[PDB]
Amino acid sequence: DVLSQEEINQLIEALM
Amino acid sequence: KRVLIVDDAAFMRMMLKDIITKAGYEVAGEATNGREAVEKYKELKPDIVTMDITMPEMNGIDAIKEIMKIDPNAKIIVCSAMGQQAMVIEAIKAGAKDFIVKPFQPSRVVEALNKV
Ligand code: BEF
Ligand SMILES: [Mg+2]
């Protein structure tokens, strides 16, 4: 269940 | 900018150090597990840390928590195979500023160094 880097960039922004 | 590279894999530490220096940063030191990472962070006081998750002795999450205690303004980029949503959330909650999943492309390391 590993996310993509775009998935992560997205998730990081969400988290800020 | 002085970087501490944390990862238990000799090859990864080798390739990260190569990317960081060629991007104009200074490699301050390396650590091979979470306890050493906290130990080196205290000793070296780097500007930036790159952090693996899966390591013997003490994982990246706990090392993040340990470095944040030593220094609330520590700047830590995770670089790990453990790219699940719950791990990204946990690493960001613990105080990391960025997260790069392995395998990664080298430009993403560069932008992460810049960002911090
Ligand atoms: F060992 Be890692 F968390 F890629
Ligand atoms: Mg590892």
Q: How many CB pairs under 8 A join A and B?
A: 32
B59 lines ligand 1 (CB under 6 A): no
Nearest to B78 by CA among B23, B57, B55, A14: B55
Experimental method used, please? X-ray
Nearest to B34 by CA among B19, B12, B49, B48: B49
Q: How far is CA B94 from CA A1, B14, B19, B74, in A?
A: 21, 26, 26, 11
Mutation test residue for ligand 1: of B15, B52, B61, B100, the one with most atoms within 8 Å of CB: B52
Spell out the domain ranges in chain B: 1-116
Superfamily of domain B1-116: Response regulator (3.40.50.2300)
CA distance B16 to B29: 12
Q: Are strands B48-51 and B2-6 parallel, antiparallel or unpaired?
A: parallel
CA distance B76 to B49: 5
Interface check for B100 against chain A (CB to CB < 8 A): the answer is: yes
Residue B75 to chain A, least CA–CA distance (Å): 15
Q: Which residue in chain A is spatially nearest to B84 when comparing CA positions?
A: A2
